[PDB]
Amino acid sequence: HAPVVFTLRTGIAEGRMVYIGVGGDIDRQVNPKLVVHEGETVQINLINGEGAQHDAVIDQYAARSAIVSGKNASSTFSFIASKVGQFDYYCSLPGHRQAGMQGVLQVVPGNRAEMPSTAADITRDPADLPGPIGARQAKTVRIDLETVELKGQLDDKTTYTYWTFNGKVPGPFLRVRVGDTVELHLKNAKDSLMIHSVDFHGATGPGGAAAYTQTDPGAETVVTFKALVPGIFVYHCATPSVPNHITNGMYGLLLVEPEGGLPQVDREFYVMQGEIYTVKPFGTSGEQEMDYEKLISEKPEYFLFNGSVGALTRTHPLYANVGETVRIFFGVGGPNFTSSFHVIGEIFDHVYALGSVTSPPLTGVQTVSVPPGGATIVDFKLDRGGRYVLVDHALSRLDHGLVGFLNVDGPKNDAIMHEGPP
Amino acid sequence: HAPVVFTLRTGIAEGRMVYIGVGGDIDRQVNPKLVVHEGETVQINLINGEGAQHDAVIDQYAARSAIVSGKNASSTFSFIASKVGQFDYYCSLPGHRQAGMQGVLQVVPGNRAEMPSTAADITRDPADLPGPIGARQAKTVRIDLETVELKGQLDDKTTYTYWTFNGKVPGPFLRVRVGDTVELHLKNAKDSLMIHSVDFHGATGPGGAAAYTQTDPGAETVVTFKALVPGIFVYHCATPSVPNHITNGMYGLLLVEPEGGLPQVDREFYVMQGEIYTVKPFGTSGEQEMDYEKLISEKPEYFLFNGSVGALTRTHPLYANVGETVRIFFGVGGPNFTSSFHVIGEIFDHVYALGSVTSPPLTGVQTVSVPPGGATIVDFKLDRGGRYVLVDHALSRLDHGLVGFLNVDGPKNDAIMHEGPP
Ligand SMILES: [Cu+2]
Ligand SMILES: [Cu+2]
Ligand SMILES: [Cu+2]
Ligand SMILES: [Cu+2]
Ligand SMILES: [Cu+2]
Ligand SMILES: [Cu+2]
Numbered sequence: 001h002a003p004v005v006f007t008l009r010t011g012i013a014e015g016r017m018v019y020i021g022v023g024g025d026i027d028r029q030v031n032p033k034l035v036v037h038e039g040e041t042v043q044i045n046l047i048n049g050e051g052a053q054h055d056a057v058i059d060q061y062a063a064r065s066a067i068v069s070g071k072n073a074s075s076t077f078s079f080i081a082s083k084v085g086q087f088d089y090y091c092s093l094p095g096h097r098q099a100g101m102q103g104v105l106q107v108v109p110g111n112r113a114e115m116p117s118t119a120a121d122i123t124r125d126p127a128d129l130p131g132p133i134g135a136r137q138a139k140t141v142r143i144d145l146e147t148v149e150l151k152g153q154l155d156d157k158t159t160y161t162y163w164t165f166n167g168k169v170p171g172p173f174l175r176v177r178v179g180d181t182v183e184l185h186l187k188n189a190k191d192s193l194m195i196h197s198v199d200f201h202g203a204t205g206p207g208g209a210a211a212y213t214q215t216d217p218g219a220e221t222v223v224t225f226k227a228l229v230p231g232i233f234v235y236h237c238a239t240p241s242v243p244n245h246i247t248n249g250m251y252g253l254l255l256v257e258p259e260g261g262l263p264q265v266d267r268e269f270y271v272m273q274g275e276i277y278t279v280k281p282f283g284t285s286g287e288q289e290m291d292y293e294k295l296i297s298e299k300p301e302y303f304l305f306n307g308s309v310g311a312l313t314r315t316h317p318l319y320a321n322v323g324e325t326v327r328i329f330f331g332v333g334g335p336n337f338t339s340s341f342h343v344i345g346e347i348f349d350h351v352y353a354l355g356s357v358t359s360p361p362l363t364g365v366q367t368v369s370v371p372p373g374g375a376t377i378v379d380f381k382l383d384r385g386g387r388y389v390l391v392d393h394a395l396s397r398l399d400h401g402l403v404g405f406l407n408v409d410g411p412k413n414d415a416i417m418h419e420g421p422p
Numbered sequence: 423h424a425p426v427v428f429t430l431r432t433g434i435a436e437g438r439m440v441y442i443g444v445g446g447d448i449d450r451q452v453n454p455k456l457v458v459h460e461g462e463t464v465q466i467n468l469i470n471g472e473g474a475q476h477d478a479v480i481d482q483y484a485a486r487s488a489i490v491s492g493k494n495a496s497s498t499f500s501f502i503a504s505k506v507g508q509f510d511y512y513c514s515l516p517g518h519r520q521a522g523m524q525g526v527l528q529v530v531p532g533n534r535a536e537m538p539s540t541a542a543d544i545t546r547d548p549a550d551l552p553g554p555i556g557a558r559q560a561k562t563v564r565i566d567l568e569t570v571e572l573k574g575q576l577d578d579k580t581t582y583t584y585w586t587f588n589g590k591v592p593g594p595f596l597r598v599r600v601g602d603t604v605e606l607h608l609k610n611a612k613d614s615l616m617i618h619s620v621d622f623h624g625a626t627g628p629g630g631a632a633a634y635t636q637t638d639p640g641a642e643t644v645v646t647f648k649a650l651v652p653g654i655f656v657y658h659c660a661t662p663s664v665p666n667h668i669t670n671g672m673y674g675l676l677l678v679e680p681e682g683g684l685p686q687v688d689r690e691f692y693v694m695q696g697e698i699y700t701v702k703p704f705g706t707s708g709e710q711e712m713d714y715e716k717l718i719s720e721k722p723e724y725f726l727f728n729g730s731v732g733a734l735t736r737t738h739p740l741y742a743n744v745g746e747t748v749r750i751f752f753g754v755g756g757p758n759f760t761s762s763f764h765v766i767g768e769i770f771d772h773v774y775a776l777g778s779v780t781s782p783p784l785t786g787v788q789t790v791s792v793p794p795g796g797a798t799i800v801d802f803k804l805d806r807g808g809r810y811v812l813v814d815h816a817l818s819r820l821d822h823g824l825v826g827f828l829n830v831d832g833p834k835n836d837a838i839m840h841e842g843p844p
Contacts, residue, residue, distance in 0.1 A: 012473045015491050017439065017521070050472065051434045052521070069437050095517025099439070099474070 001387075002313055002403060003043040003078060005283075006034050008056060010068075010091075011049035016100025019056070019089070020049065023283035031103035034089070036081040037112045042105070044089070048073040053093045058105055060087050067093070081107045114314065115156035122152030122162045122169050122249065123311040126318050126404075129173030129270040129329070132261050138179030145171065146187045147196030147215065147237070147250070154302065155309040155401065157285040160276060162307065163194065163237065163248035169307030170272035170333060171235070171252030174200075178230045178256055183222065184209060190218035195239045200225070201373065202233030202254045210238030230258035232355040232375040234272075234331045243295055243335040247277055249307055251333025253375055258357050263350075265379055266324035271312070271404065273341075273370075273392060274333040275300035282400050298336045303402035305390060312390060312404025320382055322410045325349075327379045328390075334372025340393035341376070342367040343406065345386055352377035367393050384417065385410015423809075424735055424825060425465040425500060427705075428456050430478060432490075432513075433471035438522025441478070441511070442471065445705035453525035456511070458503040459534045464527070466511070470495040475515045480527055482509050489515070503529045536736065537578035544574030544584045544591050544671065545733040548740050548826075551595030551692040551751070554683050560601030567593065568609045569618030569637065569659070569672070576724065577731040577823065579707040582698060584729065585616065585659065585670035591729030592694035592755060593657070593674030596622075600652045600678055605644065606631060612640035617661045622647070623795065624655030624676045632660030652680035654777040654797040656694075656753045665717055665757040669699055671729055673755025675797055680779050685772075687801055688746035693734070693826065695763075695792075695814060696755040697722035704822050720758045725824035727812060734812060734826025742804055744832045747771075749801045750812075756794025762815035763798070764789040765828065767808055774799035789815050806839065807832015 007022035013030040022045075026032035036042050046056050046065040055075070057064040060083060065075035084107050091101035148167045154160040165171025176182060182203070188196045196215055199208035203225040206212070212223035236242070237250030251272060255262075277295040278288040282302060294300065305312045312318060320326050332339050350361035351368050355375040370376050382388075390404035391397075413419055429444035435452040444467075448454035458464050468478050468487040477497070479486040482505060487497035506529050513523035570589045576582040587593025598604060604625070610618045618637055621630035625647040628634070634645035658664070659672030673694060677684075699717040700710040704724060716722065727734045734740060742748050754761050772783035773790050777797040792798050804810075812826035813819075835841055 015473065015475050017474055051437065052439055053437050093521070095520030098517030099515070099521055 001041050003041040004036050005043045005045065005399070007045040007047065009047045009049040010052070010054045010101070017052070017096060018100045019103055022047070023281055027284075031100070033103065034105045036105060036107050038081060038084050038107060038109050040081045040112070041078055042081050043076060043078045045076045046074060052096070054091050054096065054101065055093065056089045057092050058087050058089050064092075081105075083107060084109050117153045118157075119151040119153045119159040120167065121315060122150070122164060122167065122307045123315050124168045124170050124270060124306045125316040126269040126271055126306060126312060129268060130175040131268065133175060133177050133257055135261065136177065138177060138181075140181045140183060141176050142183040142185065143174055144185045144187070145198060146189060147192060148189045149192045149194065153308055154276065154288055155283075158288055159286070160278070160288045161248070163196070163245055163250050165198070165250060165252055169249035169251075169274070170270070170331070171250070173252065173270045173329070174235070174254040176227045176254070176256055178227055178258060180227045180256075181224060182227060183224050184213070185220060185222050186213045186215050187220045188215040188217050192217040194245070196237050196245070196250065197239045198235055199238035200233060200235040200254050202227055202229065202231055202235075202256045204228055207238050214239060227256040230256045230357045232329055232331070232352065232357060232377055234333060234373050234375050236333060236373070244290070246333055246335035247275060247290070247295060249274070251331070253329050253331045255329065262327070262357065262377070263379070265327045267320050267326050269318055269326065269328045271305055271328055271390065272331045272333050273339045273402065274304055275335065275337055276302035276304060278302065300336070301400065303337070303392065303397035303400040305402065305404045309401035318390075318404065318406040320406060320408050322382050322385050322408060325379055325381050326406070327377060329375065329377060330370060331375030332370045332372045336372055338372065339370045340367050341370050341378070342391050342393045343380070344389035344391060346380050346388050348378040349380045350378065382408050384414050423463050425463040426458050427465045427467065427821070429467040429469065431469045431471040432474070432476045432523070439474070439518060440522045441525055444469070445703055449706075453522070455525065456527045458527060458529050460503060460506050460529060460531050462503045462534070463500055464503050465498060465500045467498045468496060474518070476513050476518065476523065477515065478511045479514050480509050480511050486514075503527075505529060506531050539575045540579075541573040541575045541581040542589065543737060544572070544586060544589065544729045545737050546590045546592050546692060546728045547738040548691040548693055548728060548734060551690060552597040553690065555597060555599050555679055557683065558599065560599060560603075562603045562605060563598050564605040564607065565596055566607045566609070567620060568611060569614060570611045571614045571616065575730055576698065576710055577705075580710055581708070582700070582710045583670070585618070585667055585672050587620070587672060587674055591671035591673075591696070592692070592753070593672070595674065595692045595751070596657070596676040598649045598676070598678055600649055600680060602649045602678075603646060604649060605646050606635070607642060607644050608635045608637050609642045610637040610639050614639040616667070618659050618667070618672065619661045620657055621660035622655060622657040622676050624649055624651065624653055624657075624678045626650055629660050636661060649678040652678045652779045654751055654753070654774065654779060654799055656755060656795050656797050658755060658795070666712070668755055668757035669697060669712070669717060671696070673753070675751050675753045677751065684749070684779065684799070685801070687749045689742050689748050691740055691748065691750045693727055693750055693812065694753045694755050695761045695824065696726055697757065697759055698724035698726060700724065722758070723822065725759070725814065725819035725822040727824065727826045731823035740812075740826065740828040742828060742830050744804050744807050744830060747801055747803050748828070749799060751797065751799060752792060753797030754792045754794045758794055760794065761792045762789050763792050763800070764813050764815045765802070766811035766813060768802050768810050770800040771802045772800065804830050806836050
């Protein structure tokens with residue numbers, strides 16, 4: 001139940017008053033066939049193109065838009081494609097159907113197949129992080145990062161040129177103890193066009209290590225630094241344009257554990273939110289390219305968890321069991337937008353405000369603001385089963401790829417939430 | 423039977439698919455009421471605005487356009503408004519009438535009243551010329567011309583600033599005998615903004631008298647010249663821009679009679695064709711203004727006989743009697759367009775080719791090319807009655823005001839032309 005979306009603009013084409021497809025598999029097609037699989041949720045966005053009165057109606061679903069009157073006037077509607085077959089969408093305004101305003105919704109049996117990928121999977125699995133460090137003394141820790149430029153699967157028929165730490169977004173989850181001495185090796189791949197670097201928000205001194213790690217392609221820099229302060233820190237590339245290096249995917253988290261370790265918890269997850277600024281709108285197939293004017297004006301097309309559309313729903317969702325306490329390390333690479341981080345169907349037992357690991361966490365919190373170059377820790381107990389949904393509660397960002405699933409097996413109805421009265 | 427014309431563009435307005443009026447009393451009105459008087463001929467021009475399929479139909483007249491499909495695709499139709507009342511014009515394409523494509527034709531009893539004029543009547547009556555000079559000796563002839571700038575009635579709710587000889591278009595018909603000595607006085611009115619002058623095509627020497635008659639406002643020039651050559655000559659202002667002075671109305675005819683006089687004829691007429699180059703299209707009400715880019719590019723809006731729309735139909739038509747031989751002195755002031763001069767329902771008995779009064783006229787001629795700065799003489803016998811129609815047979819110029827009537831009382835049916843077989 002991540003909705004199949006179709007956008008229709010009313011207008012004049014092929015000598016008729018028609019619906020015209022916008023984006024996706026239907027861009028610029030007149031009265032496009034909307035192909036949907038049994039049991040999918042369907043969202044249809046109607047936008048008035050030419051300025052007559054219009055709706056869209058599907059009789060066998062008793063589903064309709066509102067009547068949209070002026071140019072750009074819009075109405076979205078949804079329904080569950082529960083019945084297989086072909087169903088007319090049409091305009092009910094006097095004569096508009098006769099004039100040509102009519103197409104077919106095709107509901108096909110069986111589950112939608114995955115689109116065979118074209119580019120490397122650049123999505124970091126949210127379970128791909130080191131677990132708690134044992135109790136142990138401070139020591140010297142060697143960390144190896146490689147900066148890799150590579151084409152990645154941004155969406156299921158859409159590619160983009162990512163810049164990464166170790167070929168994934170976000171970069172490796174780095175885990176040390178306060179007092180540790182970090183021996184960082186940064187290798188910039190031979191095939192890189194750009195100089196790359198790293199700034200750790202958990203390091204003290206020039207550029208957060210950036211001033212020592214400006215690494216030419218095929219070259220290596222080595223920096224040592226002491227993890228003086230416990231916290232959950234975003235690290236990122238700091239080679240100009242830094243915003244460019246960040247949007248392209250060069251961000252990750254460094255946990256500097258406090259002496260005690262963090263509270264014991266059953267399961268840990270690694271999630272980072274960022275934006276991608278493409279020439280073409282969200283939903284456009286093929287090789288997307290970076291739009292500099294959109295980047296510097298903060299007008300992105302993609303809002304992503306862990307690098308890709310479907311990252312945390314289709315390719316690498318979160319899995320957990322009822323009764324488990326879960327911790328999410330959540331950071332915003334950005335480069336520009338503050339996340340209103342929230343898990344639909346859960347409440348945060350603990351929220352580590354501004355990523356403070358030393359100050360007491362806040363308790364019983366629905367939603368937390370995390371700035372770009374900021375991170376936090378949330379934990380909660382999975383009291384019961386369900387699909388729990390990670391969102392930025394600036395919820396228009398759903399319509400730009402920003403949604404994740406935490407899948408937890410258990411009955412539909414228990415004492416905590418169920419269908420009838422009690 | 424000079425048709426009442428209405429232009430409709432299809433489009434989207436007031437949230438409906440509609441007809442939109444173009445020019446006239448209906449400009450930019452949606453589904454405009456077309457007001458017509460009993461027995462008028464109605465021309466409706468349909469132009470496709472937005473690119474759906476359209477026609478216009480009027481059921482009670484069995485009148486319709488063709489179906490027009492692409493943007494700018496057009497169909498004109500006509501009919502006689504023989505039945506008083508209200509009649510729907512509508513689009514017959516599936517659903518288009520329901521969608522809003524419908525207005526009313528209103529046919530009102532009685533004759534259309536004349537619009538009360540706003541500006542001076544600047545139309546030269548075609549009967550306003552001196553008759554044949556007696557047989558007599560060459561002599562000195564004094565001619566007085568006054569250059570007057572004044573607002574004139576271009577069309578029945580439309581004005582324009584005319585420049586004229588003696589407040590009318592064309593200027594006075596000048597009639598001398600070969601050998602005559604012309605003492606020309608040019609008085610430029612005190613209220614003129616511009617210097618004015620005159621070039622006679624029938625004078626020999628600098629500028630055809632123009633070099634002696636460049637007259638400041640409130641001033642007077644006097645030139646003497648010998649009429650050395652017989653001919654029918656256009657005269658015009660020759661103050662720069664000459665094309666500007668000409669379009670504004672500063673042209674007329676000089677007949678230098680050959681020694682014999684011209685062949686005896688019952689009735690004589692004075693007709694001149696010119697163009698006016700307005701910012702706004704033909705049919706636009708109010709004060710029209712000159713469009714310099716249209717003038718130098720030869721893209722006029724008005725094609726006129728004797729200065730005005732309706733000059734030779736409504737305000738000053740030609741009148742004659744069956745059996746009479748008629749002569750028309752016809753010249754093109756221009757400044758730019760060659761007239762294909764023709765009288766519908768008549769044949770030219772004699773045509774004085776290139777305005778040669780000395781070379782034998784051509785005989786039994788339907789239509790004669792007259793260049794700008796050119797004139798001719800045509801004569802014919804009115805064998806029978808009717809409304810005879812003066813045209814430039816470049817007949818799109820009908821739709822820019824270029825039409826005149828020669829009214830001749832007599833039966834509908836005689837031996838020369840009648841309804842049944844013989
Ligand atoms: Cu509609
Ligand atoms: Cu970089
Ligand atoms: Cu930073
Ligand atoms: Cu139509
Ligand atoms: Cu002049
Ligand atoms: Cu001339």
